[PDB]
Structure 1
Amino acid sequence: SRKESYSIYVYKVLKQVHPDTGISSKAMGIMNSFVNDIFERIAGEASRLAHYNKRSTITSREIQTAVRLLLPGELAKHAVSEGTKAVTKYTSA
């Protein structure tokens, strides 16, 4: 009887920003809802994107246009950053 969660990753990122601070189980729950909600918005918009342009594959280009569409303003810009960072760093080795 075992299910998935984002708790450990939310947790790690918690110890990067605030190493002194904890997270309550209901607060962690709200965070899981957050990851899953945003995952769905991003992926749905990417899927619409590929479909409107008649392509069969979601690529980092789709995820990015998605992010530009969903996310407001400065949040969007900083997200495009950490993203394209992670992707180039991945493509090298």
Structure 2
Amino acid sequence: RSRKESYSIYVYKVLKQVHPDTGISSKAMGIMNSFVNDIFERIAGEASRLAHYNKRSTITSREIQTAVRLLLPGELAKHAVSEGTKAVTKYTSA
């Protein structure tokens, strides 16, 4: 009747990318759904507060980059920032 949206299949595809021969139960899928939503809410909320401090009114990529710098601690910061920059560059070149 009423559709429900979740990141189940995308998590599955990423899992196949990293480990070609491993399945994952339903409850682990529930945890990964909730985790992806949690991280997304943290990052977007932080970017919103940041873009509101500077009296701007638009979440450009720069805000997401700074929010990822703030939230993710340590090596994850550098790796995630590199991934973001690579994705944006490959997106814009086409």
TM-score interval (norm. to shorter):
over 0.9
How far the C-alpha of 1:81 sits from its partner, in A, is 0.8
Any stretches of 5+ residues in structure 1 without a counterpart?
none
How far the C-alpha of 1:10 sits from its partner, in A, is 0.4
How far the C-alpha of 1:53 sits from its partner, in A, is 0.3
Residues in 2 aligned to 1:2 and 1:19: alpha-carbon distance in whole angstroms: 30
3-state secondary structure, aligned to 1:68: helix
How far the C-alpha of 1:63 sits from its partner, in A, is 0.3
Residues in 2 aligned to 1:63 and 1:8: alpha-carbon distance in whole angstroms: 24
Structure 1, residues 7-34: CA drift from partner, whole Å, max 9, x if none?
1110000000001001110000000001
Structure 1, residues 33-75: CA drift from partner, whole Å, max 9, x if none?
0100000000000000100000000011000000000001101
Residues in 1 aligned to 2:61 and 2:78: alpha-carbon distance in whole angstroms: 15
**Map of 1:75 onto structure 2:** 76
How far the C-alpha of 1:76 sits from its partner, in A, is 1.0
Residues in 2 aligned to 1:49 and 1:27: alpha-carbon distance in whole angstroms: 33
- Paired positions, count: 93
TM-score (norm 2): 0.97
**Map of 2:38 onto structure 1:** 37
**What does 1:10-21 correspond to in 2, within 5 Å?**
10-21=11-22
How far the C-alpha of 1:2 sits from its partner, in A, is 1.4
Residues in 2 aligned to 1:73 and 1:60: alpha-carbon distance in whole angstroms: 21
Q: Identity of paired residues, percent?
A: 100
Any stretches of 5+ residues in structure 2 without a counterpart?
none
How far the C-alpha of 1:88 sits from its partner, in A, is 0.5
Give the root-mean-square deviation of aligned CA atoms: 0.5
